[PDB]
Design a protein around this nucleic acid. Structure first.
Ligand SMILES: [Mg+2]
Ligand SMILES: [Mg+2]
Ligand SMILES: [Mg+2]
Ligand SMILES: [Mg+2]
Ligand SMILES: [Mg+2]
Ligand SMILES: [Mg+2]
Ligand SMILES: [Mg+2]
Ligand SMILES: [Mg+2]
Ligand SMILES: [Mg+2]
Ligand SMILES: [Mg+2]
Ligand SMILES: [Mg+2]
Ligand SMILES: [Mg+2]
Ligand SMILES: [Mg+2]
Ligand SMILES: [Zn+2]
Lengths: 211, 175, 38, 142
RNA sequence: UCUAAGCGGGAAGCCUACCUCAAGAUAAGAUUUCCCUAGGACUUUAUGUCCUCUAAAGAGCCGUUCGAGACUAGGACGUUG
RNA sequence: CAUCUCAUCCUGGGGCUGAAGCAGGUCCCAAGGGUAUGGCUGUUCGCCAUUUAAAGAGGUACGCGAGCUGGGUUUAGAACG
RNA sequence: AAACAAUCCAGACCGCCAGCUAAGGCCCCAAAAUCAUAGUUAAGUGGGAAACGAUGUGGGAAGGCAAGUCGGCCUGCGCGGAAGAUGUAACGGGG
């Protein structure tokens, strides 16, 4: 599955001719540049490595400078690989460019991003735990965990127990979203619904794995 | 052990070779094979196969008695094949072989089709009758069971797909 | 099928079988005699 | 006079390759472990690794008797509340033949740092080819 | 006679398949690219020591901060902004 | 807030039926997921009302008070038989 | 004897990098037979359990009927009957 790397630009709506409003997310795609092609003979697997964006040359190390200059491309802000096959590795070469026209209107996709971070959170937010009595004699136990085990059989807390801790800030993939518009002159994709993360964060769009 | 200790009559054209633990037959209908268990000897005269036990134990007689019975069928078939005939009972059920793939209509919401293997062939005299013909007796029985398993015969009106020489239990449903 | 500890013939058309270390009874006259020792 | 211990600096490990095609598993494992520990050498010292290197090839052609190919179970526990995992001998031999020798031989060795250091000298490969052609292994007919 | 030899069908169950983590997997894997090429003595004679010369690729301290955050860690930028 | 077993309540796969169909009875395989809200009483239970595909049976110090409660029981007051 | 006051062998005056045995053992963990001879078992039985069921398989003393076949007793070793709760978990393990 070959796809695109873009930036989440915001969330909008599109009215249709029948009057239905469609909630949409806008994704900006600066056209991706192929920096490397990994094949079975030198790597063990087939993949296309891609860069997008721009970086100032005082923040590009000498190693990354040599890697970017081995191809023709300019240094972007990130590098990412896509697992492919041949008949998908057909005409792809270093110094090539993948644009928004890889997709079409009415296609189903998966979009992966990095969700927003909520910090250190408790059981009520992290695991939908229920709260205890507010005023019927309850002392200091409202959003606390309650019981965490049993009694001397087994004499320990089990692994994978649901407790308080860090929430958010992970890699999350949303499947089954539809392409609503492919604007070629502004280089933008618009998809239907919500996608993980904040505005301005890096997202990856690729054809759906279920089909 | 009466089945072993007896020879099979090999007619002309039929050909048998034993390069290894394999025995293959060649006649007019086709060419077959049979791997042999490691406790059986074979000694043909010219048209007379001889299956004997090695070391003459309880297990070896039992192995030879089937080593005989299956190659007797191999040679019985490569010259004169085998024929099975199934009947469909019940209005609407009908089968007609589209070329090499059999199309059956058996009271369903979708039309059934069966893709035959390479060995067996199948023809169609009328709607409510199928005939399968082959040189491999095992594969022919397998194909017959596989087609029968679609609408196996029921005991209240006898409808379904049956073997011709098959006895069907029958009941009535009063109260 | 009747799953029992004591399986045995019932009529003259009952045959006693041994499949996979299980003793069974099969009857070609009436299928309500099928037995499996278990 | 007294009984001397073998010096680790004077120990000389040798290299051997053993073919596993058509062989009972445990009756091979006992020989492998005896060579890995060094019991066949007159300088054997229970606190010194005076053993030899072994290469096993064709690890997916090893045999079991009876009905064990279908009936011998290998177990694992992930240490989560219900994480017991089960597999066969025959599923594990066509998919990971190195682990069968790993388990069979490591169960027949001591259990401590020197036992961990002895199992390192066993090298198991599924096919007919190994990469250690520079070490010049001998054909050990076990 | 479904089994002894041989060949099959068969479940929300099992293994895959979908998402996330994962080489401290001490067996610590792979690929692309980048950096370092001076002199003298010297004896416990070997990845031996001592004195001048050198200080790279890079990382961090510090600062402006963040849709990242308990402290950390992580992301961006520091005048050619 | 749980975790396990299977002697399985629902859903899945079957044999027999005094199995026409729909729906049942009984037995076998199956532990992946799921498996009500109220009135009364301190109740566990139980009865009733209205739902549900279903409202399983059990082990875990009759799981769980250095996690909460304190209505019952089982201190000191007072009264009835 | 896995671990195991009360079981089995055996009653410790001190020292030895000497030797023979007991109960129990001799494929590896772990010292000593991958020892020799003749059989049985296919169930991992061995390595947990009854009434009862059954052409499993080895041995023995007899019968009926005419290429043998029939079914009856006495026996060695096995099969089913056999479901539980943290994790394989009813050989210490590997095997
Ligand atoms: Mg935040
Ligand atoms: Mg208080
Ligand atoms: Mg409060
Ligand atoms: Mg403990
Ligand atoms: Mg059950
Ligand atoms: Mg109630
Ligand atoms: Mg009220
Ligand atoms: Mg309690
Ligand atoms: Mg009270
Ligand atoms: Mg009082
Ligand atoms: Mg002891
Ligand atoms: Mg020894
Ligand atoms: Mg021997
Ligand atoms: Zn009967």
């Amino acid at each position: 599955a070959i796809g695109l790397v873009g930036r989440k630009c915001g969330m909008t709506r599109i009215f249709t001719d029948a009057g239905v409003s469609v909630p949409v997310t806008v994704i900006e795609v600066d056209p991706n540049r192929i920096t490397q092609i990994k094949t079975l003979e030198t790597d063990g697997y087939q993949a296309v490595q891609v860069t997008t964006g721009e970086r100032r040359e005082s923040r590009v190390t000498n190693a990354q400078k040599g890697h970017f200059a081995k191809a023709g491309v300019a240094a972007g802000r990130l590098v990412k690989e896509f697992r492919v096959t041949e008949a998908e590795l057909e005409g792809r070469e270093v110094g090539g460019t993948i644009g928004v026209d890889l997709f079409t209107v009415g296609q189903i996709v998966d979009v992966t991003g990095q969700s927003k971070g909520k910090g250190f959170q408790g059981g009520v937010k992290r695991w939908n735990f229920r709260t205890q009595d507010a005023t019927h004699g309850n002392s200091v136990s409202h959003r606390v965990l309650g019981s965490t085990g049993q009694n001397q059989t087994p004499g320990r807390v089990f692994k994978g127990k649901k407790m308080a801790g860090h929430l958010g800030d992970e890699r999350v993939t949303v499947q089954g979203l539809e392409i609503v518009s492919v604007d070629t002159e502004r280089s933008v994709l618009v998809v239907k619904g919500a996608i993980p993360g904040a505005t301005g964060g890096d997202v990856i769009v690729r054809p759906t794995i279920k089909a | 052990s009466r089945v072993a200790k007896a020879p099979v009559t090999v007619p002309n054209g039929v050909t048998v070779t034993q390069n290894g633990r394999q025995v293959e037959v060649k006649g007019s209908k086709g060419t077959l094979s049979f791997n042999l268990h490691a406790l059986v000897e074979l000694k043909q005269e010219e048209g007379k196969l001889q299956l004997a036990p090695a070391k003459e134990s309880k297990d070896a007689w039992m192995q030879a008695g089937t080593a005989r019975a299956v190659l007797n069928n191999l040679v019985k078939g490569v010259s004169e094949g085998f024929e099975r005939k199934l009947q469909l009972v019940g209005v609407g059920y009908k089968a007609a072989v589209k070329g090499t793939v059999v199309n059956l209509n058996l009271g369903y919401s979708h039309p059934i089709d069966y893709a035959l293997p390479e060995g067996v062939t199948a023809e169609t005299p009328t709607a409510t009758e199928i005939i399968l013909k082959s040189a491999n007796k095992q594969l022919l029985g397998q194909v017959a069971a596989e087609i029968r398993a679609y609408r196996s015969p029921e005991p209240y009106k006898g409808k379904g797909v049956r073997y011709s020489d098959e006895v069907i239990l029958r009941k009535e449903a009063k109260k | 099928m009747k799953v029992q500890a004591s399986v045995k013939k019932i009529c003259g058309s009952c045959k006693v079988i041994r499949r996979n270390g299980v003793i069974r009874v099969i009857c070609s006259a009436e299928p309500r005699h099928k037995q499996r020792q278990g | 006079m007294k009984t001397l211990s073998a010096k680790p600096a004077e120990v000389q490990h040798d290299w051997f390759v053993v073919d596993a095609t058509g062989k009972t598993l445990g009756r091979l494992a006992t020989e492998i472990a005896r060579r890995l520990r060094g019991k066949h050498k007159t300088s054997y010292t229970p606190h010194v690794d005076a053993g030899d290197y072994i290469i096993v090839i064709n690890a997916e052609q090893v045999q079991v008797t009876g009905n064990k190919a279908l009936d011998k179970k290998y177990y694992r526990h992930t240490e989560f509340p219900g994480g017991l995992k089960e597999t066969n001998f025959e599923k594990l031999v066509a998919h990971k033949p190195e682990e069968i020798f790993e388990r069979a031989v490591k169960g027949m060795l001591p259990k401590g740092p020197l036992g961990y250091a002895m199992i390192k000298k066993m090298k198991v490969y599924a096919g007919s080819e190994h990469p250690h052609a520079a070490q010049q292994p001998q054909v050990l007919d076990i």
